[PDB]
Amino acid sequence: RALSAWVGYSVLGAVLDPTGKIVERFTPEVAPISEERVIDVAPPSYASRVGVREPLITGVRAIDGLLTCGVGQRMGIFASAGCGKTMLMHMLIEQTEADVFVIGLIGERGREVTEFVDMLRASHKKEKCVLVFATSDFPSVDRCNAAQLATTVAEYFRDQGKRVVLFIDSMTRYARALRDVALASGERPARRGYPASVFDNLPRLLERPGATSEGSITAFYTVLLESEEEADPMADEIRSILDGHLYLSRKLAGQGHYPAIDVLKSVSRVFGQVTTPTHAEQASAVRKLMTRLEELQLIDNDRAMQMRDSLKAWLCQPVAQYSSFDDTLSGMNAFADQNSA
Numbered sequence: 453r454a455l456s457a458w459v460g461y462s463v464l465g466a467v468l469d470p471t472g473k474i475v476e477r478f479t480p481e482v483a484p485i486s487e488e489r490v491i492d493v494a495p496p497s498y499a500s501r502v503g504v505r506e507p508l509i510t511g512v513r514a515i516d517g518l519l520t521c522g523v524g525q526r527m528g529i530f531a532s533a534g535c536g537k538t539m540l541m542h543m544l545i546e547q548t549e550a551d552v553f554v555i556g557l558i559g560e561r562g563r564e565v566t567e568f569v570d571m572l573r574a575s576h577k578k579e580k581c582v583l584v585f586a587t588s589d590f591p592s593v594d595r596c597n598a599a600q601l602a603t604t605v606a607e608y609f610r611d612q613g614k615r616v617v618l619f620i621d622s623m624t625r626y627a628r629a630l631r632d633v634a635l636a637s638g639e640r641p642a643r644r645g646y647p648a649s650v651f652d653n654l655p656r657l658l659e660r661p662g663a664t665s666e667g668s669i670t671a672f673y674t675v676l677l678e679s680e681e682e683a684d685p686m687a688d689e690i691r692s693i694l695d696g697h698l699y700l701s702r703k704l705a706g707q708g709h710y711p712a713i714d715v716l717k718s719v720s721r722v723f724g725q726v727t728t729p730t731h732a733e734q735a736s737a738v739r740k741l742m743t744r745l746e747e748l749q750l751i752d753n754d755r756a757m758q759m760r761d762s763l764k765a766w767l768c769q770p771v772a773q774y775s776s777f778d779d780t781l782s783g784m785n786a787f788a789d790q791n792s793a
C-alpha cells in the first residue's frame with residue numbers, strides 16, 4: 453500500500469489515477485519538474501508549523517462574513533444527497549485566490565469524475581488545478597492511495613512556497629477504505645466495524661495540511677450524512693479533528709437557496725483568530741439576529757418577516773456572483789445594525 457508517486461509541476465492541469473500516472477490533461481504541461489515522494493508520509497512536527505493567522509477569502513458571503521476560513525485551516529463540508537456540495541466546491545475553486553488547487557475524488561462514480569473534469573475544463577484557472585481520482589471500480593487500497601496522493605501533491609506545492617487548497621470528497625469513503633484495507637489483513641474490528649488503525653490513520657491524513665513558514669495547505673474535507681443522523685459515528689468522530697465544519701441542508705436545497713449553508717449549524721474554529729474585532733462583533737450580532745428569527749418561527753411581524761427574507765437573500769449566492777470582502781463586511785454591518793434596533 454505504501455507506494456511512491458511522481459508529483460510536481462508536471463501534473464498541473466492533469467488527472468491522476470491512484471498511482472500518480474497522468475491519465476488526462478485539460479491544459480498543456482506547465483513544466484517538466486517532478487519528484488518521487490512517498491504518499492503516506494508523517495505530518496509536520498507540531499513545533500514547526502505556524503498558527504492559523506491569515507484568513508482565506510473564498511468570495512462567498514456566507515463564509516467570508518459568518519464562517520471565515522484561515523490560510524492553513526482544515527474545514528469540513530457536511531452534506532447528504534442533493535445538498536449542492538459539488539457546486540460549492542466549484543464555487544470555492546473559482547472565487548478563492550490561491551496558487552494551486554488540488555481536488556481528490558475518492559470512491560466517486562466515474563461519471564461524476566468525468567463531469568468534474570469537464571467542469572475544470574471551462575474554469576479560467578484550470579492550469580492551477582490537479583485532479584486525483586479513484587472510482588468505485590478501484591479497490592479500497594487505491595481509493596486510499598488517491599487521498600494520500602492528493603495530499604502529497606498539495607505538500608509538494610507547499611514546499612514550493614505556493615498557497616495550496618486541497619479538497620477531499622467523502623472523507624467517509626477514505627475512512628471506509630482504510631477500514632477495508634486493514635480488515636483485509638489481520639486486524640480486529642469490534643468498534644462499529646472500524647479497527648484500531650483507522651483512528652490512528654484518519655488524523656495522520658488530516659494533520660498534513662496547515663500553514664508553514666512560506667507555503668500553506670488549506671484543506672476541505674467532505675462528510676456524508678446518509679439520511680438518518682441516528683447512525684452516524686464517523687461524521688462526528690471526523691468533526692472533532694477538524695478546525696471547523698460546514699453544514700449543508702437538504703431543507704434550503706429543496707427551497708432552492710444555495711449555497712445551502714445552515715449558518716447556525718456551522719462554525720470556523722479559527723474565526724476569531726482570523727477576523728478583526730469589528731468583524732468579530734458584527735458576526736456575533738448577525739448570529740443573534742439569525743437565532744432570533746428562527747427562534748420566532750411558528751407591523752412587528754411584517755418587519756421581521758421582510759428581515760428574514762432580506763437575510764436569506766443576502767446569504768443566497770449563485771456561483772456566477774462574486775462578492776469582495778469589503779462588500780461582504782458592508783452587508784454584515786447592515787444586518788448587525790438591524791440587530792441593534
Ligand SMILES: Nc1ncnc2c1ncn2[C@@H]1O[C@H](COP(=O)(O)OP(=O)(O)O)[C@@H](O)[C@H]1O
Pocket residue numbers: 531532533534535536537538539540710770771
Ligand atoms: N445556479 C443554480 N441554479 C439553480 N439550481 C442550482 C444552481 N446551482 C446548483 N443548483 C442545484 O444544486 C443541485 C446539485 O446538487 P449536488 O452538487 O449534486 O449535491 P451533491 O454534490 O451532494 O450530490 C441541483 O439539483 C441544482 O438544482
